[PDB]
Amino acid sequence: HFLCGVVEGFYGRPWVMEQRKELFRRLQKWELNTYLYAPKDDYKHRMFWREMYSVEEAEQLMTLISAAREYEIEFIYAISPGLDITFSNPKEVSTLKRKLDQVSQFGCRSFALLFDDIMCAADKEVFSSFAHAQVSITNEIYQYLGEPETFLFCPTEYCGTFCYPNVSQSPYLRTVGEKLLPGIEVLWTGPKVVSKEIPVESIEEVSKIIKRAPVIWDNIHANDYDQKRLFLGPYKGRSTELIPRLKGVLTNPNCEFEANYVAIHTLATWYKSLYSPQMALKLALTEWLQEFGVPHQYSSVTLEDLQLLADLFYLPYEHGPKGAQMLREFQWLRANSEKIEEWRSRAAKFEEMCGLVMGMFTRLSNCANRTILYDMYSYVWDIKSIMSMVKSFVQWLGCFRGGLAGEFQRLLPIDGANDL
Amino acid sequence: HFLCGVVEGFYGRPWVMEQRKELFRRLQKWELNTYLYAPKDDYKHRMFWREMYSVEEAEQLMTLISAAREYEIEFIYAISPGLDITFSNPKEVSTLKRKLDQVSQFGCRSFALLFDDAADKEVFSSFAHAQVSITNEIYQYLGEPETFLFCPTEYCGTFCYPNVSQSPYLRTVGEKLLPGIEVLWTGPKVVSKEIPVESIEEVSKIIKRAPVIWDNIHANDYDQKRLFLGPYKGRSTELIPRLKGVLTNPNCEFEANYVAIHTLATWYKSYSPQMALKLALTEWLQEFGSVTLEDLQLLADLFYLPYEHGPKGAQMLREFQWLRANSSVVKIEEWRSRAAKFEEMCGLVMGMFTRLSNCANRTILYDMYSYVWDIKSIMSMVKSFVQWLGCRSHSSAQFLIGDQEPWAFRGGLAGEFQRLLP
Numbered sequence: 001h002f003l004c005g006v007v008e009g010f011y012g013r014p015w016v017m018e019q020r021k022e023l024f025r026r027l028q029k030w031e032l033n034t035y036l037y038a039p040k041d042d043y044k045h046r047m048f049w050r051e052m053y054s055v056e057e058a059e060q061l062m063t064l065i066s067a068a069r070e071y072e073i074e075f076i077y078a079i080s081p082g083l084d085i086t087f088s089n090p091k092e093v094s095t096l097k098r099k100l101d102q103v104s105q106f107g108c109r110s111f112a113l114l115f116d117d118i119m120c121a122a123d124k125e126v127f128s129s130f131a132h133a134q135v136s137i138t139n140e141i142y143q144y145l146g147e148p149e150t151f152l153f154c155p156t157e158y159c160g161t162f163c164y165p166n167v168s169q170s171p172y173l174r175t176v177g178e179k180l181l182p183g184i185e186v187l188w189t190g191p192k193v194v195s196k197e198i199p200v201e202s203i204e205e206v207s208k209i210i211k212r213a214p215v216i217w218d219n220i221h222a223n224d225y226d227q228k229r230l231f232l233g234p235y236k237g238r239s240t241e242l243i244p245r246l247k248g249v250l251t252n253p254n255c256e257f258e259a260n261y262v263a264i265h266t267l268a269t270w271y272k273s274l275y276s277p278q279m280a281l282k283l284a285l286t287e288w289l290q291e292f293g294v295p296h297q298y299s300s301v302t303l304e305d306l307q308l309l310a311d312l313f314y315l316p317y318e319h320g321p322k323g324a325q326m327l328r329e330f331q332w333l334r335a336n337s338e339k340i341e342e343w344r345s346r347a348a349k350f351e352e353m354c355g356l357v358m359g360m361f362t363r364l365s366n367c368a369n370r371t372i373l374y375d376m377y378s379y380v381w382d383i384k385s386i387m388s389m390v391k392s393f394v395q396w397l398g399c400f401r402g403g404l405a406g407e408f409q410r411l412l413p414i415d416g417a418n419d420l
Numbered sequence: 421h422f423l424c425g426v427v428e429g430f431y432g433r434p435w436v437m438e439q440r441k442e443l444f445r446r447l448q449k450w451e452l453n454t455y456l457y458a459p460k461d462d463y464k465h466r467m468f469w470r471e472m473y474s475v476e477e478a479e480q481l482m483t484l485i486s487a488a489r490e491y492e493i494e495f496i497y498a499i500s501p502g503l504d505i506t507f508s509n510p511k512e513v514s515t516l517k518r519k520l521d522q523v524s525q526f527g528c529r530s531f532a533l534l535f536d537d538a539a540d541k542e543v544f545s546s547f548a549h550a551q552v553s554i555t556n557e558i559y560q561y562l563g564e565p566e567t568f569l570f571c572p573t574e575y576c577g578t579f580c581y582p583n584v585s586q587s588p589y590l591r592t593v594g595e596k597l598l599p600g601i602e603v604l605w606t607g608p609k610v611v612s613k614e615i616p617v618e619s620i621e622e623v624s625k626i627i628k629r630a631p632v633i634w635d636n637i638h639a640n641d642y643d644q645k646r647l648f649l650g651p652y653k654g655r656s657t658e659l660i661p662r663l664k665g666v667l668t669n670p671n672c673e674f675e676a677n678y679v680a681i682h683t684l685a686t687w688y689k690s691y692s693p694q695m696a697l698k699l700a701l702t703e704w705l706q707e708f709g710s711v712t713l714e715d716l717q718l719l720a721d722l723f724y725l726p727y728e729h730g731p732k733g734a735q736m737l738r739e740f741q742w743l744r745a746n747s748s749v750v751k752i753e754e755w756r757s758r759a760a761k762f763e764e765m766c767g768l769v770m771g772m773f774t775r776l777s778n779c780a781n782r783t784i785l786y787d788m789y790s791y792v793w794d795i796k797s798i799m800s801m802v803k804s805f806v807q808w809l810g811c812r813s814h815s816s817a818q819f820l821i822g823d824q825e826p827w828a829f830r831g832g833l834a835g836e837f838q839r840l841l842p
Contacts, residue, residue, distance in 0.1 A: 011793065013786035041789065047778050194826050225827040227645050227794045228834055295463055299470035299515055312833050316826040323833045327840075334840060366467055373461070374433035378644045381431065385642070386837050393841055401838070403646045404722050404733050405798045409830055411744060412805055414820055416839040418829035 003150070003248025004271045005034030005073065006264060007217055010224040012255050014039035017064050019257040024071040026261075030268035035068060036152070036250050038078035038114060046080035050095045052102050065107040076150060077103045078112035087133040088126040096137070097144055104145065111145065112152035113138050114187075130156065131175035139181050147183055152215060154187035160202060161192050167205050177210035185247050188214035194222065196317045197237040203245050213247045220316065221253035221263035230259055230379045233314035234281035235266040240274040256375035261288045262310060285310065293368035300363040308360050312383050326353050327420055330390060337397040347394050354391035357384055423567065423665030424688050425454035425493065426681060427634060430641040430672050434459035437484050439674040443681075444491035450685035455488060456532060456569070456667050458498035466500035466534075470515045472522050485527040496567055497523045498532035507550035508543035516554070517561055524562065532569035532604075533558060547573065548592035556598050568601045569632065577608035577619060584622055594627040602664055605631035611639065613727045614654040620662050630664045637726065638670040638680040647676055647791045650724035651697040652683040660690040675787040678704045679720060709780040715772040722769070722795050736765050740802060747809040759810050766803035769796055797827065 005027050008015055015023070020035070027035065037045075044051055053061060068075035079099065086092050100111055115134050119127075127133040138153050145151075155176055157163045163170045176186065188206055190198040198216065207213055218238075221231040231254060238249070251267055253260040265284035269275070285306045292301035311320025319327070329350050336343055361384040367373055402409065409415055425447050428435055435443070444455065457465075464471050473481060488495040499520065506512050520531055533555050544550040551573075559568050572593055574580040580587045593603065605623055607615035615633065624630050633655075638648040648671055655666075668684050670677040682700035683693070701716045721730020729737065739762050749755050773796040779785060808819045820828060831838065 012789045041777060041782075041785070043780075043782055192823075192825060224793075225797075225825075226830055226832070227790050228830070229826075229832040295468050295471065297468060297471055299472075314833075319833050327833065327836055330837070330840060365461065366463075368463075370461075370463065377432040377461070381641075382644045383834050386834050389841065390837055400726065401643060403643070404729050404737065405645050405795050407737060408740070408798050408802050411741065412801060414828065416829075416836065417820070418824075419836045419839060 001033075002243070002246070003034040003074070003215060003250065004267070005032040005036070005248075005250055006260075007036035007038055007250040007252045009036065009038040009040065009078075009217065009252040010222055010255050011040045012224055014042040015257050017060055020064055021067045023257070024067055024073045026264060027073050028071040030265060031272060032264070032268050033072070034074050034076065034248065034250060036076045036078060036112060038080070038112065040080070045078070046083065049079050049081050050092075050099060052099055058102070058106065061103065061108075062106040069107065074110055074150065075108050076110040076112055076152060077108045078114050078152070080114040080116065082115040082117050082134075082156070085137075086120055086122060087137055088123045093137060093140065096141060100141065100145060110148055110150035110152075111141075112154065112187075113141060114154040115156045116154055116158065117156075129171065129175060131172045132179065135176055135179045138184060139179075142181055142184055151184045152187055153180060153184050154217065158187060158217070159189040159192055159195070160206075167202075168209055170209065173206070173209045177212070180210075182212070186210050186212060186214045187217045189217050189219055194219045194225075194316050195237065198242060200239060200241050200245060203242060207245070213245055215248040215250065216242075216246055218249055218251045221251055221260065223254040223256075228379075228382065229316075230254060230256070230313035230376070231315055232259060232262050232310040233318070233320060234262065234277040234284070235270050236277040236315060238270070240270065243271075258369075258372040258375035261291075281310065291369055291372060292364070294366065295368045300366045301360075302363070304356075305360040305363060308356055309364075309380065312357070313379060322353075324420065326350065326387075329353070330394065331420070333394055333397065344398065347398060350394060351391050354387045354394075357387040422660070422663070423454040423494070423632060423667065424684070425452040425456075425667055426677075427456035427458055427667040427669050429456065429458040429460065429498075429634065429667075429669040430639055431460045432641055432672050434462050435674050437480055440484055441487045441491075443674070444488050444493040446681065447493050448491045450682060452681070452685055452688070453492070454494045454496065454665065454667060456496040456498060458500075458532065458534060460500075465498065466503070469499050469501050470519060472519060478522070478526065481523065481528075482526045489527070494530060494567065495528055496530040496532055496569065497528045498534050498569070498571075500534040500537065502535045502537050502551075502573070505554075506538055506540065507554050508538075508540045513554060513557065516558060520558065520562060529565055530567035530569075531558075531562065531565060532571065534571040534604075535573050536571050536575055537573075546588065546592060548589045549596070552593055552596045555601060556596075559598055559601050564600055569604055570597060570601050571604040571634065572627075575604060575634070576606040576610055576612070577623075578610075584619075584626060587626065590623075590626045594629070597627075599629065602632050603627045603629060604634045604667075606634050606636055611636045611642075611726050612654070615659065617656055617658050617662070620659055624662065630662055632665040632667065633659075633663060635666055635668045635684075638668060638677065640671045640673075645791070645794060646726070647671055647673070647723040647788065648725055649676065649679050649720040650728065650730060651679065651693040651700070652687050653693040653725060655687070657687065657689070657691045660688070673787040673791075675784040676791075678707070707781055708776075708784065711772075711775050711779050714768075715775060718768055718772050719776075719792070723791060732765075736762065736799075739765075740806065743806055743809070747812075750810050750813055756810060759806050763803050763806060766799045769799045772796075801828075 006023060040046055065075050081096060119130050123133055142151050157170055157172050160167050191202050223229050223231055251263060253263040262284040266280040269280040269283060289303050289306060294300055308322050311322035314320040333347055333350060361380050364373060364380055426443060460466060464473060485495050501516055535551050540550050555570050574587055574589050577584055580590060606612060608619055640646045640648055668680060670680040679700040683696040686696040686699060705713050705716055718732050721732035724730040724733060743759055743762060746755055773792050776785060776792055805819060
């Protein structure tokens with residue numbers, strides 16, 4: 001059974017139970033089938049992974065695992081012991097069984113052991129390598145829980161760039177593919193952490209070394225790695241030819257829950273297709289518009305508002321066409337500040353485009369869905385403030401920002417080394 | 421009778437009732453006394469100011485107004501009609517009376533009309549005449565309440581036209597606003613670095629009363645990457661005898677305003693910014709869990725104040741400016757010794773992030789996580805760059821070798837526009 005859905009696997013404030021239940025509704029509404037629970041800073045998932053859940057947390061996880069069953073989403077419970085586990089100490093192993101047993105009595109039946117970060121001297125004696133230590137404990141938790149239907153394993157070398165010396169010849173992956181039990185699945189993020197493309201030939205290459213088709217943990221829409229970035233563009237860079245070669249695809253999307261309508265809608269479109277990223281974004285935006293109401297009044301947002309907004313917060317390696325256009329046009333205006341009529345005519349057209357950013361922010365702050373507006377607020381306010389300043393500046397040619405973080409970044413020479 | 425406390429007055433996600441009750445608890449713990457409710461994006465506070473609250477919204481306001489009394493915090497309800505009100509039309513005035521009447525039946529006794537953002541040319545001779553007419557009539561209609569506030573459109577020095585002393589607008593306001601109504605003022609600027617004593621006497625003369633400061637010193641709603649954990653600073657305690665109050669508009673992240681409100685509380689002793697911050701940091705440390713006192717000293721110095729970095733922050737930046745400026749040399753032992761010590765200081769940022777993400781107080785950590793991770797990753801890159809600069813006596817490789825992850829290039833499309841501004 002091919003797994004396709006969402007992993008909540010980013011850093012920072014995790015989602016809340018009501019947001020996750022609502023996630024289960026949209027996964028079901030769009031015919032996806034999986035949720036992987038792995039919030040990096042939900043303290044009992046990784047930092048304090050040994051602490052069992054309290055009476056009140058047990059009641060919230062049981063309720064959340066029941067909702068996943070109600071909406072026919074498979075619930076996968078992950079745990080990340082890798083930061084301070086002692087693999088050779090029986091009580092660490094018993095604690096890891098005791099804590100999965102407690103989640104198992106909450107209704108959960110599928111699990112994952114993740115090893116995404118960074119070996120003690122006591123385990124150098126018992127285990128021949130880091131890959132042997134993880135595979136030993138993963139296999140033993142696997143068999144100890146009755147060999148569950150779905151059990152996932154995220155390796156430490158979880159992408160091409162993290163493979164040493166490379167994918168095909170890695171000591172680490174080779175031990176994993178040889179000694180990890182055939183029934184356990186392997187997570188893989190592609191050639192990179194955030195893969196621009198995931199080529200079929202790269203998936204073939206990792207499948208030989210790990211001896212099975214991987215489950216993609218996809219970071220295409222993840223935004224936890226830069227405060228100013230948001231990704232509302234379509235699922236893209238993965239050919240539908242990957243589907244016969246994969247055990248599943250689970251996206252790790254933006255931290256702000258309401259901003260992942262497009263990211264999950266288009267992945268669902270891609271899973272059912274063969275696939276046009278631009279057509280997928282138009283179906284996702286057209287459906288999304290219905291959620292931007294006007295408050296009922298007893299005493300606004302357009303489709304082109306959302307097209308502009310997505311083009312300004314698109315994808316990690318690409319801007320949408322309206323974003324690249326306004327940025328190409330402002331480069332030309334700045335560079336060329338007869339030819340005089342051209343400059344003013346194109347400056348006039350560019351201030352109008354700036355006005356459309358201001359107008360999209362204004363109608364978005366009038367919408368009835370306060371949740372969507374709050375999740376995206378700082379991003380939309382920021383792009384509006386800047387374009388209001390850019391617009392002023394274009395007019396001028398015609399007449400501490402960022403904090404300490406910003407001041408250090410301007411002093412690095414690769415500051416705008418990827419600008420257009 | 422001096423009002424001092426918090427205005428929740430920023431843009432974006434408002435606080436939830438659980439955070440607000442906890443704010444009242446701290447206002448009381450630290451001897452402050454006032455809360456002004458004015459979140460710009462509570463749709464019924466401003467955008468749809470005429471719409472009554474629903475049965476469930478009403479019940480939430482009553483419970484919260486009751487908690488303010490339990491904690492003896494004065495609750496002031498604000499409203500902003502200025503974006504689309506027709507001041508000269510009676511039905512509009514009634515709409516605003518009925519809407520304040522409804523909050524008044526929730527237990528609320530203090531109010532504010534904010535004007536910080538037609539056919540009225542016929543009835544009113546200026547915009548100040550329009551607002552003061554409706555402000556005075558609302559004021560008396562509610563029985564001249566104990567506290568009634570008025571935020572003018574020219575609410576700071578730079579917003580005054582042509583200047584403070586000569587503004588038609590403020591002088592109309594000072595002449596025609598009833599003595600029982602108070603006037604809000606942010607100082608010489610929206611975010612004032614200092615609020616000089618003579619500026620307050622100058623503004624008090626034209627508005628004919630002592631102002632209540634709406635203080636934006638710690639607001640961070642106007643820049644995504646900014647957080648302000650430094651002490652209340654730039655206002656002499658001499659202002660306390662010439663002010664009717666001070667209400668600070670702090671960071672949008674609720675847990676990040678421990679220092680901002682604690683230090684204002686310390687200052688309300690009718691004052692040393694550095695000493696106030698050592699009291700606030702020592703107390704704040706207790707709410708975590710591990711995090712050390714010098715961690716929070718470092719953290720406050722990296723997110724200090726809108727016009728200043730903390731001493732540990734300003735130090736790492738001039739030192740890295742000098743290292744960058746004199747890298748050509750790589751006599752020469754000076755540059756390497758200072759590069760090692762500066763690499764050591766970056767470690768203290770990394771170590772402060774690590775213990776903060778292992779701390780038991782998850783609420784505080786989630787409020788600041790995006791800010792702490794951003795500074796830690798930049799300094800990790802800044803440390804890498806200094807290492808690269810000293811490793812060049814023996815390597816010709818470039819700083820970035822090959823194909824990068826997206827976080828090597830920061831800011832998205834917004835960042836690309838800002839780099840294009842001079």
